[PDB]
Write an enzyme that holds these catalytic residues in place. Sequence first.
Site, short mmCIF file in Angstrom:
data_model
loop_
_atom_site.label_atom_id
_atom_site.label_comp_id
_atom_site.label_asym_id
_atom_site.label_seq_id
_atom_site.Cartn_x
_atom_site.Cartn_y
_atom_site.Cartn_z
NE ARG A 37 -40.33 -24.58 -4.17
CZ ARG A 37 -39.17 -23.94 -4.33
NH1 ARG A 37 -38.89 -23.32 -5.47
NH2 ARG A 37 -38.29 -23.92 -3.33
CG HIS A 41 -42.95 -23.66 -0.19
ND1 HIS A 41 -41.57 -23.74 -0.20
CD2 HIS A 41 -43.39 -24.86 -0.66
CE1 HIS A 41 -41.20 -24.94 -0.62
NE2 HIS A 41 -42.28 -25.63 -0.91
CG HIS A 162 -44.58 -32.88 -6.17
ND1 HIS A 162 -44.04 -33.65 -5.16
CD2 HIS A 162 -44.32 -31.59 -5.85
CE1 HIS A 162 -43.48 -32.85 -4.27
NE2 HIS A 162 -43.65 -31.60 -4.66
CD1 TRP A 178 -42.40 -36.09 -8.44
CD2 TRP A 178 -42.18 -33.94 -9.04
NE1 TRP A 178 -41.77 -35.44 -7.42
CE2 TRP A 178 -41.61 -34.12 -7.75
CE3 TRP A 178 -42.17 -32.65 -9.61
CZ2 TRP A 178 -41.04 -33.06 -7.03
CZ3 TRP A 178 -41.59 -31.60 -8.89
CH2 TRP A 178 -41.04 -31.81 -7.62
CG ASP A 207 -42.41 -37.65 -4.62
OD1 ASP A 207 -43.30 -36.89 -4.17
OD2 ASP A 207 -41.46 -37.25 -5.32
#
Length: 248
Positions: A37, A41, A162, A178, A207
């Site tokens: 992540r 990002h 994810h 997830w 999603d």
Amino acid sequence: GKSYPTVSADYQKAVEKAKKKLRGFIAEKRCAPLMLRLAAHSAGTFDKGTKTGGPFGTIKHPAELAHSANNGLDIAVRLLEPLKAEFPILSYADFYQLAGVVAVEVTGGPEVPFHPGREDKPEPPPEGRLPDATKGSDHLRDVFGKAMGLTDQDIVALSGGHTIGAAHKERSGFEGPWTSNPLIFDNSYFTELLSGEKEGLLQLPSDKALLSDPVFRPLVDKYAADEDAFFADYAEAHQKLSELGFAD
Ligand SMILES: C=CC1=C(C)/C(=C/c2[nH]c(Cc3[nH]c(Cc4[nH]c(OC(C)(C)C)c(C)c4C=C)c(C)c3CCC(=O)O)c(CCC(=O)O)c2C)NC1=O
Ligand SMILES: [Fe+3]
Ligand code: NA
């Protein structure tokens, strides 16, 4: 379209040693998803039209960490500082992208090619470039396509990232993993998306948007049926993401 810069032999040696130290650290700390992540990002703030933002070390800045979309990433930056200090020659920009590549590898994902040479840039991009999880396909194309310059294939493949990790009610507000195996990188993100909502698992509106889009859906289907095809497309997309604005 890439022309990668030359870095010294000492720089290359540091990349290699840091890669190994990152494997051990990330595996031990169980923080692969958070590191992925952080890297994404990091990279996802790139705007192709202005050539601003991107994976250039700015996420370490308190000002960028304060962005709402970055809730919890201060943990990631703190976790990496001691290791980063063992590799003073490396840019933060390179270090964070290397951590993302390693996160994918140590959870069993594809080996994403890595090229060094990103420079640390002085100015964080403006807030609001990262995607909104409550929105759909039009928004995904605005952010990944119009801003970052990535393809529809890249959008669906990257969404598969994810397959590791979870949301936290204190960070985004969403909550839970997830997948049933949040530290294993595989194609289960897509399998789960297809099967419907199972109790204990998370699906963001972003999603679900993949299932109803004419271009995104066949990709979801492909990846659910063919993990090798997912790994190939994922490796391509992650490399591109990690190199936005870099080396062209
Ligand atoms: C497709 C668009 C997209 C959206 C809107 C998105 C949103 C999003 N992603 C994550 C967590 C989240 N995201 C990711 C990889 C990730 N994320 C990401 O999209 C961005 C925003 C970078 C473009 C990319 C390109 C990648 C990697 C390829 C991981 C590994 C985790 C788990 C973190 C953890 O376990 O702590 C959360 C929960 C944060 C929290 O509450 O802890 C949310 C709301 N992620 C998305 O992909
Ligand atoms: Fe995400
Ligand atoms: Na998984």
